[PDB]
Structure 1
Amino acid sequence: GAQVSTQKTGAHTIHYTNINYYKDAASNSANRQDFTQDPSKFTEPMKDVMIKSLPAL
């Protein structure tokens, strides 16, 4: 039950504890530490992979 996770500190006793008390997944706290990203779907939505140094046309 003790899900020991790390706190938020800036890169130049950092762990916290969290218990799920209620029987529903919507009762939990916010998922504030999921930091994935994939910007290639909007920046490079091409069929062919485009190289920077190679010319486009």
Structure 2
Amino acid sequence: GSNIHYTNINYYENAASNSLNKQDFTQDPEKFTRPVVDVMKEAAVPLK
């Protein structure tokens, strides 16, 4: 996959000149998948 021996040195003044970002993580999708006020546990019924 990705290298653990990558050399990141910027040759230019402006950050716009830099190469692509190398993070690429993902985050908990809750803000999109479960944007509700009241927590609804997986083991219980949703509405009661």
Q: TM-score range by the shorter chain?
A: 0.7 to 0.9
Identical-residue share of aligned pairs (%): 64
Kindly indicate whether structure 1 or structure 2 has the higher relative contact order, using CA contacts under 8 Å at least 6 residues apart: 1
Aligned length: 47
TM-score normalised by structure 1 residue count: 0.67
RMSD: 1.9
Which structure: greater strand fraction?
1
Q: Which runs of 4+ in 1 moved over 6 A?
A: none
TM-score normalised by structure 2 residue count: 0.77
| Unaligned stretches of 5+ residues in structure 2 | none
| Unaligned stretches of 5+ residues in structure 1 | 1-6
